[PDB]
Amino acid sequence: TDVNECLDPTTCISGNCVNTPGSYICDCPPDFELNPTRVGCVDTRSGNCYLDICSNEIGVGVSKASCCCSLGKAWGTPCEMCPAVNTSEYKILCPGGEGFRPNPITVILEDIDECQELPGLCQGGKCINTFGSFQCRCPTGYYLNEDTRVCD
Ligand SMILES: [Ca+2]
């Protein structure tokens, strides 16, 4: 009877909690929707990921969080600018900070595999995924352009 679950910080990942007598509801901001177990909010749309304002495509048909919580700068069609890293929108989209995104079914944070999802981060090179990051090695004679993410 005394219980307001919205006071629990685990409650309603990336959503707004509203207390109810024996439970609680999670209201999801625009572009997010409640997950199957109703513990949080995820964006399940698919769109292209871009390194620039939209251009310089680095992934195809990925989620907005996979794009924007990694090195993507814009996403989707029409283009949606990734939220800046010190905003409330980034907090909701990227609740684990950079490198990670919530699993769309369980909302548990998981590494983004940049090599699988954003292969354009190492074009012409060899990508190795890591936990929270990735590495790109360019083949002999070629060098990573830090700006376009192309080997040469
Ligand atoms: Ca990774």
What is the distance in A from the centroid of ligand 1 to the CA of 111?
5
Residues 6+ apart with CB under 8 A from 72: 49, 50, 51, 58, 59, 66, 82, 118
Bridge partners of residue 16, in order along the sequence: 27
Task: Say whether 99 sits in a helix, a strand or coil.
Answer: coil
Experimental method: X-ray
With CA atoms as reference, report the closest residue to 55 among 71, 70, 69, 73. 73
Phi, psi of 122 (to 5 degrees): -150, 60
What is the distance in A from the centroid of ligand 1 to the CA of 125?
16
Q: Which residues are within 5 Å of ligand 1 (an ion), measured at CB?
A: 111, 129, 134
What is the distance in A from the centroid of ligand 1 to the CA of 133?
4
With CA atoms as reference, report the closest residue to 65 among 107, 19, 18. 107
Strands (DSSP E) found in 28-88: 33-34, 41-42, 47-52, 55-62, 74-75, 80-81
What is the distance in A from the centroid of ligand 1 to the CA of 10?
24
Which one-letter DSSP state was computed for residue 93? H
What is the distance in A from the centroid of ligand 1 to the CA of 98?
10
What is the distance in A from the centroid of ligand 1 to the CA of 91?
19
Q: Please, are residues 129 and 111 in contact by the beta-carbon 8 Å criterion?
A: yes
What is the distance in A from the centroid of ligand 1 to the CA of 70?
8
What is the distance in A from the centroid of ligand 1 to the CA of 54?
23
Domains and CATH numbers, the chain: 1-45 (2.10.25.10), 46-110 (3.90.290.10), 111-152 (2.10.25.10)
